[PDB]
Amino acid sequence: REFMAVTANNSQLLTWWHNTGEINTQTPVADGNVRQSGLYSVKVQTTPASSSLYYDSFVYLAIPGNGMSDQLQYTQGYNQTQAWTSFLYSHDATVKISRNGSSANSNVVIRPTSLNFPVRYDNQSVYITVPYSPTGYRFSVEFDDDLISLAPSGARQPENALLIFASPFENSSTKPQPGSPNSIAPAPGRVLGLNTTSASTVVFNPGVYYFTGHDHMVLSSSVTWVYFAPGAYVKGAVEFLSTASEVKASGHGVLSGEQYVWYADPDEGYQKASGANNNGLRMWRGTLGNSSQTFVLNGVTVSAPPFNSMDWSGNSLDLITCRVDDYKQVGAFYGQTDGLEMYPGTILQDVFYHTDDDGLKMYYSNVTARNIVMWKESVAPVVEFGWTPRNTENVLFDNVDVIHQAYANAGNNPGIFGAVNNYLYAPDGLSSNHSTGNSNMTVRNITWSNFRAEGSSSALFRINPIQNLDNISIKNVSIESFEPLSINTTESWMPVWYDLNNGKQITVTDFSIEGFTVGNTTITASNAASVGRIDGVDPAYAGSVHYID
Numbered sequence: 100r101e102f103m104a105v106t107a108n109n110s111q112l113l114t115w116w117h118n119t120g121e122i123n124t125q126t127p128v129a130d131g132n133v134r135q136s137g138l139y140s141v142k143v144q145t146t147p148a149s150s151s152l153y154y155d156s157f158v159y160l161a162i163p164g165n166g167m168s169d170q171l172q173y174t175q176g177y178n179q180t181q182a183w184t185s186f187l188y189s190h191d192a193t194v195k196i197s198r199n200g201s202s203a204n205s206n207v208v209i210r211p212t213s214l215n216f217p218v219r220y221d222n223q224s225v226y227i228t229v230p231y232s233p234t235g236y237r238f239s240v241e242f243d244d245d246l247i248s249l250a251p252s253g254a255r256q257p258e259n260a261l262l263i264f265a266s267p268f269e270n271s272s273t274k275p276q277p278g279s280p281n282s283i284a285p286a287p288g289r290v291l292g293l294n295t296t297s298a299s300t301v302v303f304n305p306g307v308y309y310f311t312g313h314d315h316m317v318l319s320s321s322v323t324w325v326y327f328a329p330g331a332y333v334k335g336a337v338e339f340l341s342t343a344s345e346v347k348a349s350g351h352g353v354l355s356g357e358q359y360v361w362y363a364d365p366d367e368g369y370q371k372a373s374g375a376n377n378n379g380l381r382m383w384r385g386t387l388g389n390s391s392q393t394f395v396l397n398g399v400t401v402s403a404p405p406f407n408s409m410d411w412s413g414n415s416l417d418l419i420t421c422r423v424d425d426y427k428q429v430g431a432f433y434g435q436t437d438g439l440e441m442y443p444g445t446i447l448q449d450v451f452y453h454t455d456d457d458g459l460k461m462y463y464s465n466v467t468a469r470n471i472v473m474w475k476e477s478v479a480p481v482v483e484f485g486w487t488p489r490n491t492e493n494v495l496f497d498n499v500d501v502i503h504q505a506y507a508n509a510g511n512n513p514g515i516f517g518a519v520n521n522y523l524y525a526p527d528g529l530s531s532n533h534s535t536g537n538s539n540m541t542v543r544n545i546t547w548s549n550f551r552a553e554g555s556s557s558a559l560f561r562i563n564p565i566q567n568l569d570n571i572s573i574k575n576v577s578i579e580s581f582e583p584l585s586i587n588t589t590e591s592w593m594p595v596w597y598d599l600n601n602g603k604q605i606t607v608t609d610f611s612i613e614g615f616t617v618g619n620t621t622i623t624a625s626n627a628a629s630v631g632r633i634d635g636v637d638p639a640y641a642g643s644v645h646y647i648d
């Protein structure tokens with residue numbers, strides 16, 4: 100009979116397919132179709148490797164503009180595409196990646212490179228042995244012959260990326276059990292009525308679902324759980340109306356904003372928002388009442404966000420906290436596609452971020468984020484804590500691997516650790532005016548540890564102390580190489596700042612750097628300014644920056 104995809108669904112492996120897959124790299128796919136990679140084929144086999152059957156794993160594809168050529172102007176203008184595949188596993192598995200029969204043999208580089216998974220080449224394919232880890236893995240498979248240079252940084256990156264998301268099975272807390280109480284499971288196609296349903300749980304089983312580019316998934320106040328099953332592909336954006344103690348989005352399916360134009364405004368017919376009014380549609384949105392709420396986000400893959408990925412509505416955001424795990428953001432070629440907000444008390448871990456704006460937004464206290472892979476594009480710092488002065492304390496970001504960066508100039512506000520200017524007076528984040536800070540606020544006890552920048556990188560830090568800084572520690576940061584000196588994105592700086600109202604000088608105390616390396620060179624106080632390119636620390640703060648050697 101004609102060849103058909105064969106998927107796995109057992110206790111050791113789960114893969115899926117879509118019968119409405121569409122090979123298309125230039126226009127929007129049909130409402131009920133799923134854009135599929137025409138370059139990469141992926142199959143998976145639980146070890147040990149044998150003549151046993153390999154199971155097909157659907158490879159999704161995201162393209163800049165999502166097929167809407169008139170939206171390309173809102174991207175960085177590169178020609179990169181991003182494909183990805185997800186599967187669940189509970190045992191080591193071999194991932195077999197194939198390219199068409201006419202593709203020549205090419206070695207691959209897996210990022211993060213620290214993974215060091217066994218890789219073998221045979222019969223026009225690449226076999227990667229992925230070990231089972233309870234927190235799974237999110238990595239990039241880069242073919243040497245597919246690498247291109249991105250001007251003007253010269254960054255070497257895949258023209259056609261391929262991401263692999265191997266995740267653990269879903270427990271009873273992230274997967275609705277059979278015939279769950281007061282649940283509703285919409286049929287494939289156009290999804291209607293969820294904004295007025297009396298259901299508590301919304302279940303999206305395998306299949307394709309879509310709102311349209313002129314509607315989104317507004318969930319009624321009774322909905323506290325939306326589940327995206329592995330194999331479910333939902334074109335839309337989520338907004339909880341529930342003010343309950345917990346609102347949850349889980350499952351390993353996909354939530355794609357590909358049908359929305361950039362900056363789509365939900366209050367203006369979903370047309371592009373007028374005058375950068377900040378009302379672009381978020382992929383995750385909630386609204387608070389007068390009681391605490393926890394947003395649990397687990398397993399989901401968000402693709403093609405039309406604007407910032409997430410923001411909650413409310414007068415006091417101290418009432419919201421997040422619990423994020425095994426989550427991915429892909430195909431974010433548009434600008435202002437920020438990572439999630441990490442509200443007070445947040446624990447975020449095992450995440451993959453493809454973003455063209457603020458990545459890790461350190462705006463709230465008592466936050467812990469760890470095990471993150473980031474494909475930074477061309478705008479904003481990897482870590483951001485500028486824009487507005489804040490009282491923020493007790494933050495820990497650990498094990499963050501920025502596998503790629505493609506900045507172009509100083510105006511992009513580049514840098515691993517950054518704090519741009521005051522948005523009220525410098526909306527684009529860059530200005531020589533350093534007198535709009537707040538001397539009554541302080542960012543204290545911050546730890547950024549085990550950060551790694553693969554390939555060419557922007558500056559270690561470009562921080563405007565818009566409020567006082569105290570006890571900020573950088574421990575173990577490796578930069579493979581720096582972007583060209585010429586583009587002004589690699590020199591680190593920290594200019595002296597003053598209070599907006601009384602002119603008091605903003606203070607910086609105990610800002611330490613330990614375990615900083617550039618390529619094969621260890622950075623110390625001796626070569627920090629030269630090899631480390633840390634030549635912009637204001638003399639008033641120089642005595643507060645300590646190199647622990």
Ligand SMILES: OC[C@H]1O[C@H](O[C@H]2[C@H](O)[C@@H](O)[C@@H](OC[C@H]3O[C@@H](O)[C@H](O)[C@@H](O)[C@@H]3O)O[C@@H]2CO)[C@H](O)[C@@H](O)[C@@H]1O
Nearest residue numbers: 172173174433434435456478479510511512526527528
């Ligand atoms: O507050 C908005 C935004 O301001 C800054 O972004 C600026 C960039 O740093 C500049 O390089 C330049 O980039 C233009 C570029 O913006 C993309 O977002 C867009 O997708 C693309 O089509 C366009 O060519 O201008 C922007 C401001 O417009 C700041 O760095 C951001 O963090 C901030 O979100």
Ligand SMILES: *[C@@H]1O[C@H](CO)[C@@H](O)[C@H](O)[C@H]1NC(C)=O
Nearest residue numbers: 106107108114115305329330
């Ligand atoms: C796997 O099998 C279970 C049990 O029948 C089913 O609920 C689920 O939808 C299947 N998943 C896929 C993607 O095959």
Ligand SMILES: *[C@@H]1O[C@H](CO)[C@@H](O)[C@H](O)[C@H]1NC(C)=O
Nearest residue numbers: 137138198199200201202203
């Ligand atoms: C086959 O794969 C190569 C990359 O290995 C790609 O450049 C080529 O376009 C593909 N062939 C076609 C046109 O399908």
Ligand SMILES: *[C@@H]1O[C@H](CO)[C@@H](O)[C@H](O)[C@H]1NC(C)=O
Nearest residue numbers: 177178179247248249250258
């Ligand atoms: C994509 O852009 C790169 C430079 O960034 C260029 O070398 C490559 O040829 C381009 N590919 C196509 C199909 O134009």
Ligand SMILES: *[C@@H]1O[C@H](CO)[C@@H](O)[C@H](O)[C@H]1NC(C)=O
Nearest residue numbers: 290291292294295314315317
């Ligand atoms: C529910 O959403 C639909 C769009 O699907 C909208 O037309 C309708 O007005 C909404 N109902 C309410 C009560 O808001």
Ligand SMILES: *[C@@H]1O[C@H](CO)[C@@H](O)[C@H](O)[C@H]1NC(C)=O
Nearest residue numbers: 342343387388389390391418
């Ligand atoms: C929160 O609002 C509810 C309903 O309006 C009310 O019953 C409750 O007393 C409020 N809680 C507080 C702390 O005021």
Ligand SMILES: *[C@@H]1O[C@H](CO)[C@@H](O)[C@H](O)[C@H]1NC(C)=O
Nearest residue numbers: 417443444463464465492493
């Ligand atoms: C952070 O945690 C501390 C306790 O360690 C608490 O006192 C403080 O209020 C918390 N900050 C916020 C805004 O939640």
Ligand SMILES: *[C@@H]1O[C@H](CO)[C@@H](O)[C@H](O)[C@H]1NC(C)=O
Nearest residue numbers: 492493494495543544545546
């Ligand atoms: C500082 O932050 C750490 C976590 O990074 C936390 O354990 C500790 O209690 C905080 N308090 C201080 C200032 O020591």
Ligand SMILES: *[C@@H]1O[C@H](CO)[C@@H](O)[C@H](O)[C@H]1NC(C)=O
Nearest residue numbers: 509510529531585586587588
């Ligand atoms: C780098 O960019 C900053 C901000 O625009 C500017 O002040 C500085 O002079 C630039 N350095 C040069 C001359 O490359």
Ligand SMILES: *[C@@H]1O[C@H](CO)[C@@H](O)[C@H](O)[C@H]1NC(C)=O
Nearest residue numbers: 523524531532533534535599
């Ligand atoms: C800096 O900006 C503030 C806010 O607009 C303004 O009041 C002040 O005069 C400016 N001073 C400088 C550095 O020119």
Ligand SMILES: *[C@@H]1O[C@H](CO)[C@@H](O)[C@H](O)[C@H]1NC(C)=O
Nearest residue numbers: 497548549574575576613614
């Ligand atoms: C920094 O890296 C070294 C390995 O070279 C490790 O021993 C140390 O624990 C790391 N520091 C932190 C805070 O993780």
Ligand SMILES: *[C@@H]1O[C@H](CO)[C@@H](O)[C@H](O)[C@H]1NC(C)=O
Nearest residue numbers: 536537538539598599600601
């Ligand atoms: C900081 O506090 C002083 C009073 O202690 C006040 O005059 C000043 O305006 C405050 N900083 C701000 C918000 O500009």
Ligand SMILES: *[C@@H]1O[C@H](CO)[C@@H](O)[C@H](O)[C@H]1NC(C)=O
Nearest residue numbers: 579580581617618619620621
């Ligand atoms: C260190 O890196 C530089 C630049 O990549 C290279 O030229 C040099 O050979 C390297 N030295 C060592 C010890 O590997």
